[PDB]
Amino acid sequence: TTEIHPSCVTRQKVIGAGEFGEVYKGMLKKKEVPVAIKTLKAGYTEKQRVDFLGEAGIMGQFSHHNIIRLEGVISKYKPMMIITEYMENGALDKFLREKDGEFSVLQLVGMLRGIAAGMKYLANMNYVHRDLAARNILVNSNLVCKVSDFGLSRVLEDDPEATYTTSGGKIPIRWTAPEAISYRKFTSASDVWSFGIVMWEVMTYGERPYWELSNHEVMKAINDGFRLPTPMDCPSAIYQLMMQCWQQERARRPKFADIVSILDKLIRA
Numbered sequence: 001t002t003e004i005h006p007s008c009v010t011r012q013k014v015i016g017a018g019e020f021g022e023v024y025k026g027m028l029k030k031k032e033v034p035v036a037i038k039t040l041k042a043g044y045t046e047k048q049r050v051d052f053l054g055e056a057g058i059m060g061q062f063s064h065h066n067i068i069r070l071e072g073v074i075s076k077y078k079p080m081m082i083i084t085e086y087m088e089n090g091a092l093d094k095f096l097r098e099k100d101g102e103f104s105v106l107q108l109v110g111m112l113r114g115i116a117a118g119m120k121y122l123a124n125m126n127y128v129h130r131d132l133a134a135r136n137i138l139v140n141s142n143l144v145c146k147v148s149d150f151g152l153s154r155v156l157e158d159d160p161e162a163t164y165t166t167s168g169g170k171i172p173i174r175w176t177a178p179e180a181i182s183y184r185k186f187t188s189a190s191d192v193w194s195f196g197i198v199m200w201e202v203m204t205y206g207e208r209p210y211w212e213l214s215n216h217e218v219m220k221a222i223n224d225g226f227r228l229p230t231p232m233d234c235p236s237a238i239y240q241l242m243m244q245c246w247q248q249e250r251a252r253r254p255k256f257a258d259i260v261s262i263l264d265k266l267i268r269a
């Protein structure tokens with residue numbers, strides 16, 4: 001994992017903030033390159049500093065067009081920084097809502113193909129995402145979609161003195177396959193279930209899955225056999241692909257390799 005020299009980075013503008021810390025737009029110096037810069041909140045524990053840097057090391061392993069690129073880290077000075085390629089259009093779910101109705105079906109299917117190609121790469125690396133959702137897909141100015149994991153599932157509001165703490169990150173119920181909710185059996189096939197949910201987010205221009213249902217209401221519906229309905233102006237072939245992703249038996253779900261091929265074929269026809 002590349003350590004970046006602080007003289008090569010300038011922070012220009014905060015573009016997001018929370019209890020993790022902040023995200024900035026900045027430049028990385030060759031002509032300079034725009035970057036996102038994620039910082040660590042002041043007062044982190046040694047566990048948080050190690051985890052923060054450990055996540056950057058995980059991201060640095062990947063090298064794919066449809067996976068957010070890590071330029072490097074600043075770990076030797078404060079504030080510590082994770083420095084990534086900049087994605088002009090931000091998160092996909094927000095982007096689609098801002099662009100409601102403004103894309104052709106072919107363009108939306110192209111976004112899904114890019115996400116699937118990133119996931120196929122992750123699957124071939126034996127990496128299970130566990131939080132595949134449009135909020136974790138980033139969009140650049142050319143509308144290229146790239147897989148990321150900011151780590152929202154691993155922010156914990158546990159009291160530092162609590163008797164009971166969350167172990168192993170929280171799970172996004174509306175995005176998670178049934179065998180992963182029940183038995184914590186997370187695999188690429190449970191990611192494929194999540195991909196089907198992303199397909200529905202995309203074809204609805206960012207509707208919240210099951211929005212009228214509580215989390216328990218969602219798990220009951222799925223267990224009763226309910227599946228998200230066909231969005232208006234969703235082609236039949238795309239909805240069939242969604243339904244295959246949502247097969248109760250994980251062995252019957254397509255592989256990300258298959259999804260990429262299926263989407264490629266539709267795009268050429």
Ligand SMILES: COc1cc2c(Oc3ccc(NC(=O)C4(C(=O)Nc5ccc(F)cc5)CC4)cc3F)ccnc2cc1OCCCN1CCOCC1
Nearest residue numbers: 015016036038055056059085086087088089090148149150
């Ligand atoms: C808040 O706004 C933005 C945040 C961005 C961003 O943030 C991050 C996302 C993920 C990570 N990931 C990580 O820190 C990690 C990760 O992703 N690991 C990982 C794990 C698995 C995997 F497959 C890939 C990556 C943990 C390391 C780090 C980030 F800093 C990265 C790139 N571009 C961004 C653009 C943003 O707005 C652009 C302007 C949008 N406008 C729209 C219109 O309204 C105004 C705003």
